[PDB]
Design a protein around this ligand. Structure first.
Ligand SMILES: *[C@@H]1O[C@H](CO)[C@@H](O[C@@H]2O[C@H](CO)[C@@H](O[C@@H]3O[C@H](CO[C@H]4O[C@H](CO)[C@@H](O)[C@H](O[C@H]5O[C@H](CO)[C@@H](O)[C@H](O)[C@@H]5O)[C@@H]4O)[C@@H](O)[C@H](O[C@H]4O[C@H](CO)[C@@H](O)[C@H](O)[C@@H]4O[C@@H]4O[C@H](CO)[C@@H](O)[C@H](O)[C@H]4NC(C)=O)[C@@H]3O)[C@H](O)[C@H]2NC(C)=O)[C@H](O)[C@H]1NC(C)=O
Ligand SMILES: *[C@@H]1O[C@H](CO)[C@@H](O[C@@H]2O[C@H](CO)[C@@H](O[C@@H]3O[C@H](CO[C@H]4O[C@H](CO)[C@@H](O)[C@H](O[C@H]5O[C@H](CO)[C@@H](O)[C@H](O)[C@@H]5O)[C@@H]4O)[C@@H](O)[C@H](O[C@H]4O[C@H](CO)[C@@H](O)[C@H](O)[C@@H]4O)[C@@H]3O)[C@H](O)[C@H]2NC(C)=O)[C@H](O)[C@H]1NC(C)=O
Ligand SMILES: *[C@@H]1O[C@H](CO)[C@@H](O[C@@H]2O[C@H](CO)[C@@H](O[C@@H]3O[C@H](CO[C@H]4O[C@H](CO)[C@@H](O)[C@H](O[C@H]5O[C@H](CO)[C@@H](O)[C@H](O)[C@@H]5O)[C@@H]4O)[C@@H](O)[C@H](O[C@H]4O[C@H](CO)[C@@H](O)[C@H](O)[C@@H]4O)[C@@H]3O)[C@H](O)[C@H]2NC(C)=O)[C@H](O)[C@H]1NC(C)=O
Ligand SMILES: *[C@@H]1O[C@H](CO)[C@@H](O[C@@H]2O[C@H](CO)[C@@H](O[C@@H]3O[C@H](CO[C@H]4O[C@H](CO)[C@@H](O)[C@H](O)[C@@H]4O)[C@@H](O)[C@H](O)[C@@H]3O)[C@H](O)[C@H]2NC(C)=O)[C@H](O)[C@H]1NC(C)=O
Ligand SMILES: *[C@@H]1O[C@H](CO)[C@@H](O[C@@H]2O[C@H](CO)[C@@H](O[C@@H]3O[C@H](CO[C@H]4O[C@H](CO)[C@@H](O)[C@H](O)[C@@H]4O)[C@@H](O)[C@H](O)[C@@H]3O)[C@H](O)[C@H]2NC(C)=O)[C@H](O)[C@H]1NC(C)=O
Ligand SMILES: *[C@@H]1O[C@H](CO)[C@@H](O[C@@H]2O[C@H](CO)[C@@H](O)[C@H](O)[C@H]2NC(C)=O)[C@H](O)[C@H]1NC(C)=O
Ligand SMILES: CC(=O)OCC[N+](C)(C)C
Ligand SMILES: CC(=O)OCC[N+](C)(C)C
Lengths: 343, 163, 350, 49, 322, 323
């Protein structure tokens, strides 16, 4: 491959990868930023961090790397190691672990007209504000902010990657034939937006609107809690002569408290809001404490009066619990993710 | 390859020869001198395929790949002994509640203890498995069914004690 | 022009950091070592790792870097990257995470007269065998072993730094402007010893290493409040089951079994907080095991009695006496386990 | 009522447990690595050129 | 880009990153240091470590890196790799388990006047004395002592960019609120080097915890159990379940004390107020069990009196604690 | 004052670290390999990974690195970076999650005779088949297969320094005691390379667990809970504590079984003996609860005697097996 070596030596003779390819001193470099999501690795509420495997799609023009193919044996494109050409220092600004750069500096593709295309793989752990409220039916709106770390908006102009037909397909690209579907989160909307500066820098923000699939938490969390609540309600039907009402009530309260403690590790530690499921659990624990108190009062109290008070408490607690649970469930289910990514 | 594409590099399976005839090695190689039997997973099949996507551009990196597959089967005896048997025994213990006399005053206690044991087993298994919503695990479905049955049995016992 | 550039070019244009600063191969390089402890980061008993932040003051004479301030405009110190000068390659030999060297390659200071000083900061995680016998009133004799990774005792030789008064600092240095007290472990003594050994059995080249013995002491107050008192209350509650009636409705066996379960939870907590090493059993763990055995015997006695009031009372008195004696004997060893009186000077000056 | 609840729940519990365990045990990997492909991809089934 | 290529080639032809960028060795390199706090990643009370995401804007004039813009078509600023140039060796004195110095050598903005602005990112896992006394309503004063390691105050002088840290880009954390922040310059003298004081800039932040998460997940169940603790004295002895309730409450309190021990550092400096409340509740539970056993071994009146006393003591303790 | 620099310059002026350090390419490089075990850092049973701190002493004669001491003032040894010289590519075959080869490139000691001694430190996270049967009194036989990856036995021959690993600097571990150690050299033929057998040195260590911690924290509570089971038959029915005590014993046994199954790897090759004992005790407790329910609905003394005799016999058998 003599012609390829000769052309490469011609192109890199006198080249400097540290200098951006501005022709005139005022010229800006336009960098089209596209994103291809290969795998939504995970979302962690405790760390408020989303881990994703992506392929960037950075495209720019480097006038220094243009050539006429007819003089160089018809070579119309070249693959060159990325470390040898100038690269825009596009980094993930909202990363959570300090890994700004890409995972592997694969070769760029340079066209004869000077168009350089780079599609490096990246493993990224971005910070994502978790919507704690509607757990487990909640939907999360995570953002990936890509910007040049050093160059200002007067030096490198970011742009959203266009579609293959030149359409303004400002979306995260997902090849449905090869995308590694996440087992817990479903991607609904995946838009991208160019954010203009308020020495300031432009940003490209990619949005992943992922909805939690609630079946796992419905089966493993919500159903046991509902069963424990039903048992705590039925505690008031156990006659005093059996001598097992206090035992059952205490066991139900302890099980609900254990479930709350377990869920506290699932939910994020941030206290900007209380998850509706956590609010339901706290209301249920308060109800069970009041039920224990009323059972102790009934035992202290005469037997017919105690039974009548027990039945009154049973009916009132059934009504209150049913109303509260129905309202909470309706509120949780109603707040579906919006059909518009920018409401 | 990420630095090269189907226009630059052609991937293919290793060919091996027997009786002066060549054939492709379309499977994962296991060398009896270097291979260590894993204690949980038995390799049932281990094929290899060169995958070429006809719709992908010839100059895209995703057009071609070589995929080696491991179809590994879990050896369940450990889980049967340590998990399945205690869970099944605790679930079937709930059937004894109907037999204890109401004068004993321990039927609800037994039912609640069975429910607590089922909850603990469900917590353990949910910790041992990913939170995938694709399907409920078989043992998880059994645990949910057992918990529902235990709740119904507790309700029945409470009604019987009331009567 | 900057005189520092002239000094740097004069010193380093013909300098080889590979070879030792000796005129003859048989000469030893004397190293002045001064480990300054900034804080004791932690002592993980479960992993048996002591994590400490130190500054490693290393001073030596390098005749190749000798200069006089009169020849270079009065420069008395030159800062040079450490990769450019020869270093004794002092490493923590008894580390556990594999980080032998320092955490930051700070510049060396080349003073006039040829003295080279290096004071890098380093975070070190080192092997410290933990004696959990007298926990939580225990003290730990952790050790830090510094040696040259490359040169033997006939090539590089260690000596302790000398204080302004001429006294050798044969101990870990503590600077009041840098030292931050650890809230869990106090530091009692920190003597240093330069050990020398023979090499191979055929009288091979000598070996030399500096061992600093951090004799540190646990501050037990927290463990008194959150561990000792709950366990004592649980063990006391064991004796109350005997006063419960020996007839239907008496929950003596239930109470005993529940207290046993609580003591088992406390045992699990202690096993989580204490390493799995089997060299010794913590006296608190021995007390917990004894209390569990006593509780099992109390359950047996309650079952026998139920199968009575006088027997219940007599068993109450016997169990109370036995529990009190056992608790006293167990706690006496922990109380008596003070740090021994030692000839070393205190590590932290009053 | 206790006896009726026994006679109702116990067979239902047994049948559900047996169904779940039989559906679990009967699971096996397919005889071919790729469904719809008759080739076994096995060392003994060398596909000579 | 030919102008900038020629400029970059000519600047670093014989540049030395070893010596200081002064014209005369008697001069002091004056470095402006501004800490920008981007995110408060974590506060670990147990390990007493605060992990923060920061940018360290260091600005100084390099005497040798000046150029005339008209020689290069009017190029007035360039971006260069920071490993090329001399840099101040800012070290975090109170590093706990991270890197002491900067490790992400991002680009340096160099202007024709020689002014260098370097804004490297860092993750600082600084040591902080976590005060657990008022947990979870506590406030933590955490600091970051940053200074040149080998250069003393007579050789390299560092000055704070502003009296307060730059919080403009601060991603507001959902657990801790920064009540105030400030940066103080100091000139402390160490025993290593008595002839020369060393300058440092200690940035400090008075963070305050948002207690809602800990109130809901810790405080409320403990309050419920403490309230149920006194209820046992109202249940008649004939029920045969007073001891079962008392021991279930004791077990719940033991579990929550275990949780709190995992939520607080084991340092013996001071007892947390929630820890003190839990210990008091455990002592009260032990006393209540002893008195119940004594009563089992008049009974109704004692039960009523003990119920009233327990309820009043519980309310008094809750008020005195909260 | 400059002869060592001159020597280092002369040695490496045209030295090649790619070719083998032999005078003739048909010769075999003789490498002496001595594993020094400094500390047994960890033995993770559930992951079946043994983490060990080692110094991998390798000694060989480099034909091209000789010098005459009289040319350099009597310098008989120098220290040089290992990256400059040819080195044997010793790889740990049974690596689990660590590095295959050495990554800490310390300096080698070169002598005037050409003898190079290299003692790089390493943290080997090797694979070991953890036998769970006799746990927690089990003896584990863990090995380290170290060998030249690309050089075959006819090209580079490795020989053990001594029949046993060097334990002179071994820091005594608090959980495992090295009862035996031995190194065996083997030549094996791999399917990759049928015409060239490859040499390896398999060091092996028979390490015995110290059971005291597990005896205190696991065995004693399990024995206490097993003992508490038999008391139910002596406890009268009128007490009402039979069912509560039996349910509490069952729950405690279940929790201890979960703890044991968390402490033991899920490999299905062999069942543990303590796990089998726990399962047997669980079955016995279930049967006891069934019989207690039968009695309550309706024997106690006969069942108590049978259970006590069977428990004593089983405990004696378990003690004999563990001893
Ligand atoms: C373990 O996991 C791995 C993956 O991780 C599994 O491997 C997969 O196995 C499945 C099952 O066999 C494979 O799916 C089949 O693939 C073949 C190959 O097709 C490919 O190459 C063709 C060119 O060679 C190309 O035309 C194909 O394109 C087709 O598919 C794409 C993607 O959807 C479309 O965009 C195209 O338009 C086009 O449809 C492709 O690149 C296919 O032949 C096969 O298709 C048959 O089955 C489909 C559903 O079963 C039908 O929709 C199809 O119409 C077609 O139907 C079949 O037609 C045959 C020819 O006439 C006929 O003989 C057969 O009876 C008939 N079957 C039916 C049911 O009607 C199908 O898509 C998949 O590619 C593998 N993935 C790999 C290798 O990466 C592996 O199985 C797992 N192992 C287990 C579970 O044990
Ligand atoms: C949280 O925790 C942080 C630390 O982590 C606390 O930060 C401290 O804040 C106080 C003020 O609240 C700071 O004191 C100020 O310090 C500056 C700088 O002083 C330095 O430089 C001076 C210049 O030469 C020098 O004089 C100083 O010497 C003083 O201190 C030494 C001992 O250190 C003493 O011996 C001397 O006599 C001097 O007192 C020192 O080198 C100083 O300029 C400030 O002066 C103010 O106060 C004086 C009167 O006190 C007044 O006259 C001035 O006009 C001015 O108002 C002041 O002393 C302290 O330096 C900070 N320390 C650190 C390590 O950051 C913070 O306060 C805590 N906050 C809360 C809410 O808990
Ligand atoms: C712990 O686990 C380790 C491994 O994980 C065990 O280590 C093994 O220990 C045994 C002894 O206990 C070793 O056997 C010895 O091996 C040496 C070396 O043999 C090699 O070199 C020979 C020289 O040419 C060669 O003949 C050998 O070939 C053998 O293998 C081939 C094919 O596998 C076979 O065809 C041959 O017939 C040989 O079997 C091999 O390459 C060998 O010198 C020893 O011989 C002594 O003992 C035998 C009888 O045992 C006797 O006949 C001889 O005269 C001589 O006295 C012996 O075979 C084995 O190599 C070790 N394996 C490994 C991988 O390290 C260890 O024992 C376990 N300890 C426990 C459980 O306590
Ligand atoms: C997921 O989160 C994203 C942010 O993390 C959401 O994007 C936000 O969407 C809202 C709703 O449209 C936008 O708010 C609007 O912003 C525009 C532009 O504001 C700018 O210009 C005006 C001057 O016209 C100026 O006043 C502002 O300060 C800004 O400079 C306004 O015109 C509208 O009035 C309105 O405020 C946010 O700007 C936008 N943020 C970003 C970063 O894009 C996204 O919608 C979320 N998705 C879901 C499904 O909730
Ligand atoms: C804290 O830990 C330190 C490190 O473990 C302890 O220091 C060591 O303590 C042991 C106690 O057994 C000493 O061992 C004894 O040493 C003497 C002296 O002989 C020395 O010299 C000969 C000849 O060179 C050599 O063979 C020995 O090994 C010693 O180096 C012997 O007579 C005894 O037989 C026995 O070996 C260590 O010498 C001692 N080393 C050091 C460097 O101090 C320290 O005691 C511990 N302190 C506390 C308070 O617990
Ligand atoms: C290090 O260099 C100094 C400076 O040259 C030496 O000290 C003396 O310097 C004067 C310069 O006026 C010379 O005339 C003397 O010959 C030097 N030597 C003595 C002994 O006075 C110094 O000797 C050198 N060596 C050391 C070990 O410090
Ligand atoms: C000279 C030198 O290395 O000083 C570092 C120690 N310091 C900065 C705390 C005095
Ligand atoms: C040639 C080569 O790389 O062989 C490596 C494989 N081995 C050592 C198992 C034969």
């Amino acid at each position: 491959s003599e012609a390829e070596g000769r052309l490469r030596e011609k192109l890199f003779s006198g080249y400097d990868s540290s200098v951006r390819p501005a022709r005139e001193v005022g010229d800006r470099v336009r960098v089209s930023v596209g994103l291809i999501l290969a795998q939504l690795i995970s979302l962690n509420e405790k760390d408020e961090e989303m881990s994703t495997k992506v392929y960037l799609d950075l495209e720019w023009t480097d006038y220094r790397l243009s050539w006429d193919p007819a003089e160089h044996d018809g070579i119309d494109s070249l693959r060159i190691t990325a470390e040898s050409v100038w690269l825009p220092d596009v980094v993930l600004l909202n990363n959570n672990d300090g890994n700004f750069d890409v995972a592997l500096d694969i070769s760029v593709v340079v066209s004869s007209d000077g168009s350089v295309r780079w599609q490096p793989p990246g493993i990224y752990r971005s910070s994502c504000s978790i919507q704690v409220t509607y757990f487990p039916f909640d939907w999360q709106n995570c953002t990936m902010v890509f910007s040049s770390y050093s160059y200002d908006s007067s030096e490198v102009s970011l742009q959203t990657g266009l579609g293959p037909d030149g359409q303004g397909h400002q979306e995260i690209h997902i090849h449905e034939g090869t995308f590694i579907e996440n087992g817990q989160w479903e991607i609904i909307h995946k838009p991208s937006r160019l954010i203009q500066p308020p020495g300031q820098r432009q940003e490209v923000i990619f949005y992943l609107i992922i909805r939690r699939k609630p079946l796992f938490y419905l089966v493993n969390v919500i159903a046991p809690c509902i069963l424990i609540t039903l048992l705590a309600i039925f505690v008031f039907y156990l006659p005093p002569d059996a001598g097992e009402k206090m035992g059952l009530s205490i066991f139900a309260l302890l099980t609900l408290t254990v479930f709350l403690l377990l869920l506290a590790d699932k939910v994020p530690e941030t206290s900007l809001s209380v998850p509706i499921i956590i609010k339901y659990l706290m209301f249920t624990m308060v109800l069970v404490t009041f039920s224990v108190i009323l059972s102790v009062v009934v035992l202290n109290l005469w037997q017919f009066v105690a039974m009548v008070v027990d039945r009154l408490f049973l009916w009132t607690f059934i009504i209150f619990t049913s109303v509260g649970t129905l309202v909470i469930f309706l509120d949780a289910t109603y707040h579906l993710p919006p059909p518009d990514p920018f409401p | 390859s990420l630095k090269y594409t189907a226009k630059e590099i052609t991937l293919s399976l290793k060919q091996d020869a027997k009786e002066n005839r060549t054939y492709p090695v379309e499977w994962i190689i296991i060398d009896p001198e270097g291979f260590t039997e894993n204690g949980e997973w038995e390799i049932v099949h281990r094929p290899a395929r060169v995958n070429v996507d006809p719709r992908a551009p010839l100059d895209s990196p995703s057009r071609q790949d070589i995929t080696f597959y491991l179809i590994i089967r879990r050896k369940p005896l450990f889980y049967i002994i340590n998990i399945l048997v205690p869970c099944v025994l605790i679930s079937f213990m709930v059937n004894l509640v109907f037999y204890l006399p109401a004068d004993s005053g321990e039927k609800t206690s037994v039912a609640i203890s069975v429910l607590l044991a089922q909850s603990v087993f469900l917590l353990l298994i949910s910790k041992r498995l990913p939170a995938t919503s694709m399907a409920i695990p078989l043992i998880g479905k059994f645990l949910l069914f057992g918990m529902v049955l235990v709740t119904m049995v507790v309700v029945i016992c409470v009604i019987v004690l009331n009567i | 022009k900057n005189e520092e550039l002239r000094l740097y070019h004069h010193l380093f244009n013909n300098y080889d950091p590979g070879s030792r600063p000796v005129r003859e191969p048989e000469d030893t390089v004397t190293i002045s070592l001064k480990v300054t402890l900034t804080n004791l980061i932690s002592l993980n008993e479960k992993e048996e790792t002591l994590t400490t932040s130190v500054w490693i003051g290393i001073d030596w004479q390098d005749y190749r870097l000798n200069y006089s301030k009169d020849d270079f405009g009065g420069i008395e110190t030159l800062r040079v990257p450490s990769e450019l000068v020869w270093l004794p390659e002092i490493v923590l030999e008894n580390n556990i995470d594999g980080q032998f060297g320092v955490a930051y390659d700070a510049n060396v200071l080349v003073y006039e007269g040829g003295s080279v000083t290096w004071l890098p900061p380093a975070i070190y995680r080192s092997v410290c065998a933990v004696e959990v016998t007298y926990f939580p009133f225990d003290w730990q004799n952790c050790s830090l072993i510094f040696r040259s990774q490359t040169y033997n005792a006939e090539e590089v030789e260690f000596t302790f730094a000398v204080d302004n008064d001429g006294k050798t600092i044969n101990k870990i240095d503590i600077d009041t402007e840098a030292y931050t007290e650890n809230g869990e472990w106090a530091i009692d003594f920190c003597p240093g010893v330069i050990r020398r050994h023979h090499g191979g059995a055929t009288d091979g080249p000598g070996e030399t290493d500096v061992i600093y013995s951090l004799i540190i002491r646990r501050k037990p107050l927290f463990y008194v409040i959150n561990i000792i008192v709950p366990c004592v209350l649980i063990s006391g509650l064991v004796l109350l089951a005997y006063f419960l009636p020996a007839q239907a409705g008496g929950q003596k066996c239930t109470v005993s079994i529940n207290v046993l379960l609580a003591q088992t939870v406390f045992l699990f907590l202690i096993a989580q907080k204490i390493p799995e090493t089997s060299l010794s059993v913590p006296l608190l763990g021995r007390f917990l095991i004894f209390v569990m055995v006593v509780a099992t015997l109390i359950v047996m006695n309650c079952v026998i009695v139920l199968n009575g009031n006088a027997l219940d009372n007599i068993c109450f008195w016997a169990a109370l006496v036995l529990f009190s004696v056992g608790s006293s004997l167990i706690f006496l060893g922990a109380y008596f386990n003070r740090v021994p009186d030692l000839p070393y000077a205190p590590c932290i000056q009053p | 009522v206790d006896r009726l609840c026994l006679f109702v729940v116990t067979p239902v519990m047994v049948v559900g447990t047996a169904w779940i365990f039989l559906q679990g045990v009967y699971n096996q990997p397919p005889p071919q690595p790729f469904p719809g492909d008759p080739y076994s991809y096995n060392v003994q089934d060398k596909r000579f050129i | 880009s030919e102008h900038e290529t020629r400029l970059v080639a000519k600047l670093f032809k014989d540049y030395s990153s070893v010596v200081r960028p002064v014209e005369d060795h008697r001069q002091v390199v004056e470095v402006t240091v501004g800490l920008q706090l981007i995110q408060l990643i974590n506060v670990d009370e147990v390990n007493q470590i605060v992990t923060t995401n920061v940018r360290l804007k260091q600005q100084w004039v390099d005497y040798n890196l000046k150029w005339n813009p008209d020689d290069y078509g009017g190029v007035k600023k360039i971006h260069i790799p920071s490993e090329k140039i001399w840099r101040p060796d800012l070290v975090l004195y109170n590093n706990a388990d991270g890197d002491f110095a900067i490790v992400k050598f991002t680009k340096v903005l160099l202007q024709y006047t020689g002014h260098i602005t370097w804004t490297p990112p860092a993750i600082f896992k600084s040591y902080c004395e976590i005060i657990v006394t008022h947990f979870p309503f506590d406030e933590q004063n955490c600091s970051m002592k940053l200074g040149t390691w080998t250069y003393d105050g007579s050789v390299v002088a560092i000055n704070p960019e502003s009296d307060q840290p730059d919080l403009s880009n601060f991603m507001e954390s959902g657990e801790w609120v920064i009540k105030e922040s400030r940066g103080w310059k100091h000139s402390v003298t160490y025993s290593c080097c008595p002839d020369t004081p060393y300058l440092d800039i200690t940035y400090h932040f008075v963070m305050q915890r948002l207690p809602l998460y800990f109130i809901v997940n810790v405080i409320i169940p403990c309050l419920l159990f403490s309230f149920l603790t006194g209820l046992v004295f109202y249940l008649p002895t004939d029920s045969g379940e007073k001891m079962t309730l008392s021991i279930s409450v004791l077990l719940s309190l033991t579990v929550f004390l275990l949780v709190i021990v995992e939520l607080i550092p084991s340092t013996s400096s001071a007892v947390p107020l929630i820890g003190k409340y839990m210990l008091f509740t455990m002592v009260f539970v032990i006393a209540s069990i002893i008195i119940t056993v004594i009563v089992i071994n008049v009974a109704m009146v004692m039960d009523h009196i003990l119920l009233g006393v327990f309820m009043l003591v519980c309310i008094i303790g809750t008020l005195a604690v909260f």
